[PDB]
From a paper:
Cobalamin-independent methionine synthase (MetE) catalyzes the transfer of a methyl group from methyltetrahydrofolate to L-homocysteine (Hcy) without using an intermediate methyl carrier. Crystallographic analyses of MetE from T. maritima reveal an unusual dual-barrel structure in which the active site lies between the tops of the two (βα)8 barrels. The C-terminal barrel incorporates the zinc ion that binds and activates Hcy.
Structures of CH3-H4folate bound to MetE from T. maritima have been determined in both the reduced (zinc-replete) enzyme and the oxidized (disulfide-bonded) form. CH3-H4folate is bound in identical fashion in both structures. The folate substrate binds in a deep cleft between the two barrels, with its glutamate tail accommodated by a groove in the enzyme surface. Folate is bound by conserved residues in the N-terminal barrel (aqua) and the C-terminal barrel (yellow) with the N5-CH3 facing away from the zinc, at a distance of almost 14 Å. In the binary complex with CH3-H4folate, the DMV loop is also recruited to the position it occupies when Hcy is bound. The changes that are induced by binding of folate are reproduced in the complex of folate with the oxidized enzyme. The orientation of bound folate in the binary complexes does not allow transfer of the methyl group to Hcy. As can be seen in Figure 5, the N5-methyl carbon faces away from zinc and Hcy; it is 11 Å from the sulfur of Hcy when the binary complexes are superimposed.
Numbering used by the authors: 0 to 353, 363 to 376, 378 to 424, 430 to 729
The structure:
């Protein structure tokens, strides 16, 4: 007998019923009861998929917005500003609106969770959702194992007084109180017949201190009386021996995303006093795997239990209806449902019951000169050439993203002649240029009205990459993304933005920047082959992006912006593995940005702090970098002030693009005065924090005007 496990199966539904029910309820189109009914149909759908493939059925997985927030509610972590917890009304207020909790990436994934705010050191059992869901399935005659976020990971993903609760001394006191609630929750489940509880402790894979593990031992020693199964994933466990010494009868490990877990098990072994649950089916990549080999690993691991490596919700629901994919691709794919089925086949087998798309020229082309990663001349030399060619005034102004998209624009996109559309875009671009000239901007953008996503736009134009029809993946709340699929050698068969950029530039005398997405970002928002090293794929895409950079140059574009939000976002969970990663990330960006001395390269990143990556940022060969400085009132400039030898230009974002309230010239002035207390005035550009697509035209116009005015006052 081989016990099969599974978790994280998508909750959105094959037709995104989850999304429709959420928005319908928010819009007031359906009652809260109807919402519940819709949610229950999804519960049954999830449970039926599990039942048909594995032995252990999870429960408490269908969060109405975010499971981390659910955990916060369970333990009473409800900020005072929300008042008395009234249920869904309060729930959604914590999740969205003007008083909502902070949203951030869940580890190194595509999913975003809501950050709990710990205002009091006393947790109490506010609502036992695990017991509720447990009983709901019991009523339908189905036994289930509650899925909960562990006490350690919960605190690790939360903050107090605006700071992370990650230091042992910070967590110690809180944990004692926190564990108590978990104790009450587990006690209530066992009394009602719960046989197994699935505890998720992914934070065990972060670079922890020995001191953290001493805390983790106390926490679990107190929970030893309960039938708990601990899961860890996304990377290897920081301290193997300490983890396997934990008083828990069964432990799950991720043997897919890393090689360290296996090596440690081979060196130290696994306690005959516990059972191993082998996470051997990838939950973040869509490829079919040779089950004979997975079976070998299980046997080697000595484990008698299997499951997916990490949550399955990072994959689409099912491959079933993807019949318009390139030739030969579907047969090599496997989504959430197919993964579940892969675990069943693996179960049966174990119990005894039972060169694709490769471009040789391109691959070799990328494989074979250092100079490809280094621009001909150093910054100081390029700066002079560029400044003489652009002739820009002190404190130049610009924007670094897409402009708002009116309903007519959005509608025009969906609605039908390839010429009527291309004509509609140019009319939009034309108006965009005129508006920028009227307000007084110095460097312009074409608006990007023809783009819906900064990665899908290019993926559709890249060879070796495919797009799906129903491959939706939950991003956060009710927002879903459709990740592209890099299945073969990547190459660019024809210019991707020339038409739009060129046309925009012919309408004005001022410089219009090219707008591109970096290679690491294109790779990280999409699924990709595991047969070849990440570096290679990144380089191939970078090559492709560079060919575009050159066409823009030949066409006469004097400035090109390259957005690489993944620079830090795709960085490993373990900072200890950052050196290796940043080595190729930096190379990838530079290969794509390897432009002529006279071409001004702009790098854009919406990070709230550069203290931890400034050393890596410094190796990127851009000429100017835009940052978000409004929130910190420019204090975010410190990382740059303290970097001895910093000399490149900085685009200082002086307006929070996430707030509709127009900023006052006086407020923006405070930000600029702050940044120029140390750095030379010639390095400073003035611009908004980030993209403008989520804003309205009547909020932008005035804001941009106030920005231009302050620019002049500054002179
Ligand atoms: C991969 N994601 C991503 C990112 N930005 C960063 N920095 N990192 C990321 O991983 N931006 C896009 C996406 C997350 N954000 C979002 C934002 C909105 C919608 C959204 O509104 N989706 C619509 C469909 C939109 C369309 O394509 O027409 C939906 O129906 O959910 C999705 C994802
Ligand atoms: O180490 C991982 C941490 O920085 C967060 O990304 C967890 O969500």
């Amino acid at each position: 007998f081989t016990k099969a496990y599974a978790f994280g199966f998508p909750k959105i539904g094959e037709k995104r019923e989850f999304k429709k029910a959420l928005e319908d309820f928010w819009k007031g189109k359906i009652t809260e009861e109807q919402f519940e009914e819709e949610m229950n149909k999804l519960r049954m759908y999830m449970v039926e998929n599990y039942r048909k493939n594995v032995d252990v059925i999870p429960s408490n997985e269908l969060s109405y917005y975010d499971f981390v927030l659910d955990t916060a509610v369970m333990v009473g972590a409800v900020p005072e500003r929300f008042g008395e917890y009234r249920g869904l009304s309060t729930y959604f207020d914590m999740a969205r609106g003007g008083k909502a909790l902070e949203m951030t990436k869940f580890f190194n994934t595509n999913y975003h969770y809501l950050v709990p705010e710990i205002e009091t050191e006393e947790f109490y059992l506010l609502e036992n959702k695990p017991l509720e869901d447990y009983l709901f399935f019991k009523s339908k005659g189905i036994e289930t194992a509650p899925w909960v976020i562990g006490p350690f990971t919960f605190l690790y993903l939360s903050k107090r007084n605006g700071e992370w609760i990650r230091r042992p001394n910070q967590m110690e006191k809180l944990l004692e109180s926190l564990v108590s609630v978990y104790k009450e929750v587990f006690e209530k489940l066992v009394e009602n017949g719960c046989k197994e509880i699935l505890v998720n402790e992914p934070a065990f894979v972060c670079d922890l201190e020995k001191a953290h593990w001493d805390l983790i031992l106390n926490v679990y020693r107190e929970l030893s009386e309960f039938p708990l199964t601990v899961f860890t994933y996304y990377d290897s466990v920081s301290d193997y021996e300490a983890c396997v010494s934990l008083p828990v009868k069964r432990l799950h490990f991720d043997f897919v995303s890393n090689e360290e877990n296996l090596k440690n098990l081979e060196k130290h072994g696994f306690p005959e006093d516990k059972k191993l649950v082998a996470g051997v089916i990838n939950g973040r990549q869509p490829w079919k795997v040779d089950l004979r080999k997975v079976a070998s690993l299980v046997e080697k691991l000595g484990a008698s239990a299997i499951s997916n490596s990490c949550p399955l919700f990072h994959l689409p629901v099912t491959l079933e209806l993807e019949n318009n994919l390139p030739g030969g691709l579907k047969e090599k794919l496997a989504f959430a449902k197919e993964k579940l089925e892969e675990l069943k086949m693996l179960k049966d087998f174990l119990e005894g019951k039972t060169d694709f798309a490769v471009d040789l020229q391109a691959v070799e082309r990328v494989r074979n000169p250092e100079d490809s990663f280094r621009r001909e001349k150093e910054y100081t030399e390029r700066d002079r050439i560029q400044r003489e060619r652009l002739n820009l005034p002190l404190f130049p102004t610009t924007t670094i993203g897409s402009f708002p998209q009116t309903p007519e624009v959005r509608k025009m996109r969906s609605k039908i002649s390839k010429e009527e559309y291309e004509a509609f875009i140019k009319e939009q671009i034309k108006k965009a240029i005129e508006l920028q000239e009227e307000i007084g901007l110095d460097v312009l953008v074409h608006g990007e009205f023809e783009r819906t996503d900064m990665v899908e736009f290019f993926a559709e134009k890249l060879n070796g990459i495919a797009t799906t029809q129903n491959g939706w993946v939950l991003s956060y709340g009710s927002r879903c993304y459709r990740p592209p699929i890099i299945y073969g050698t990547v190459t660019r068969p024809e210019p991707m933005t020339l038409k739009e950029i060129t046309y925009a530039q012919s309408l004005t005398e001022k410089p219009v920047k090219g707008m591109l997405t970096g290679p690491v970002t294109i790779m990280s928002w999409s699924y990709y082959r595991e047969d070849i090293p990440e570096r290679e794929i990144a380089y191939q895409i970078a090559l492709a992006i560079n060919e575009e950079v050159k066409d823009l140059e030949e066409a006469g574009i004097k400035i090109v912006q390259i957005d690489e939000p993944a620079f830090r976002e795709k960085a490993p969970i373990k900072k200890s593995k950052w050196p290796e990663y940043f080595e190729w990330a930096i190379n990838a960006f530079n290969l794509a940005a390897n432009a002529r001395p006279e071409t001004q390269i702009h790098a854009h990143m919406c990070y709230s702090d550069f203290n931890e990556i400034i050393e890596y940022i410094h190796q990127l060969e851009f000429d100017v970098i835009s940052i978000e400085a409004s929130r910190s009132k420019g204090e975010i400039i410190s990382a740059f002030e303290n970097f001895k030898g910093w000399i490149k230009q900085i685009g200082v974002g002086v307006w929070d693009i996430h707030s509709p309230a127009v900023p006052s010239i006086n407020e923006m002035r405070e930000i600029v005065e702050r940044v120029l207390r140390v750095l030379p005035k010639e390095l400073i550009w003035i611009n908004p924090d980030c993209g403008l697509k989520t804003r309205n035209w009547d909020e932008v116009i005035p804001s941009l005007r106030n920005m231009v005015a302050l620019a002049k006052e500054m002179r």
